[PDB]
Amino acid sequence: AQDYLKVIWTAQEASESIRKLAEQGLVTLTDSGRRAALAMVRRHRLLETFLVNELGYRWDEVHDEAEVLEHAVSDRLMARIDAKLGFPQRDPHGDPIPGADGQVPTPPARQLWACRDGDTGTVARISDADPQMLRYFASIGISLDSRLRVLARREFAGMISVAIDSATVDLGSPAAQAIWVVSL
Amino acid sequence: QDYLKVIWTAQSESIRKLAEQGLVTLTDSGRRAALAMVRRHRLLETFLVNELGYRWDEVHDEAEVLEHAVSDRLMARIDAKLGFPQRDPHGDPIPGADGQVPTPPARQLWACRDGDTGTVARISDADPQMLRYFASIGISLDSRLRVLARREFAGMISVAIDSATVDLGSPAAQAIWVVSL
Secondary structure (H helix, E strand, O other), X not given: OHHHHHHHOHHXXXXXHHHHHHHHOOOOOOHHHHHHHHHHHHHHHHHHHHHHHOOOOOOOOHHHHHHHHOOOOOHXXXXXXXXXXXXXXXXXXXXXXXXXXXXXXOOOOEEOOOOOXXXXXXXXXXXXXXXXXXXXXXXXXXXXXXXXXXXXXXXXXXXXXXXXXXXXXXXXXXXXXXXXXXXX | OOHHHHHHHHOOOOOHHHHHOOOOOOOHHHHHHHHHHHHHHHHHHHHHHHOOOOOOOOOHHXXXXXXXXXXXXXXXXXXXXXXXXXXXXXXXXXOOOOXXXXXXXXXXXXXXXOOXXXXXXXXXXXXXXXXXXXXXXXXXXXXXXXXXXXXXXXXXXXXXXXXXXXXXXXHHHOOEEEEOO
16 A cells, blocks of 8 residues: 555555555645655665665666565664665665655756757766666666766757767667756 | 574474475475575674674564565675675574585583583574673673583573673573583
């Protein structure tokens, strides 16, 4: 039932259990659903950061693991992970790690598809909904904090070329439309 | 399924269900499946203590639950973190990935006789209160001991530490294993 909270919430970022969340005064996300979904997101993202940074994972596999440990990790263990991790703020993908209060440090970023020619920015967020995408960005050089310079906006070709802190590369419309970037 | 561990440490109808899986009084695949869970609930304890700053006596109730959610890749990478842990924070030997299991000719403390000396190497984590007792009186792994007075009745034994002299009861002394050198 709690698997849809990190969905209904992450939408702005099967009815069986939907009528079961509202059975807890939880759901139309009310005031409690925000902190519930934000807590579960905190656990998931923190697990991603821990597996990647400490246990030497790659940012594409790290998801399918944390989707089960979230239902077997205590709050003590989670707080000591958050302590060892340096109290982080973001995924290895750039997904913001909220605080225990509802901080959710969202960065002022728009999608690489929303940019135009001559614009520059820093890769602050990469979508994780598909590991092949993260494998591709690992293949090129699109990591976090990478600085991109948009060269060509060919909407007719459904592409957009960018320059990377290294070389140029051509990214498709759905490719460069996951990856979020902060301007200038 | 947790019985796989307790039947391995010493070596109802809950054990027959492992003969159903072809595991048990341990078979080759049975003692090879106990090696798994035993590596889990051991690498997990030494990871909690050594990396995430735990303090024993409360790593049991955690690893006993994480053991049912750790993948072989996760366990192998934890082992690669520690690199390459041969023994529990309580003293239980980490079974080698091949299945060697280090060799500790270790006797009980109560089973020792008067005058015997030896390095302690394994402590039971069944009772965390007992672990806090062992921490406060000053006994931990690798501290040489000397059986001074094994009193068969009523359940007492006086031992000399290298830190002292402790009068340990039988329920306590039945939780210390010791090698002799």
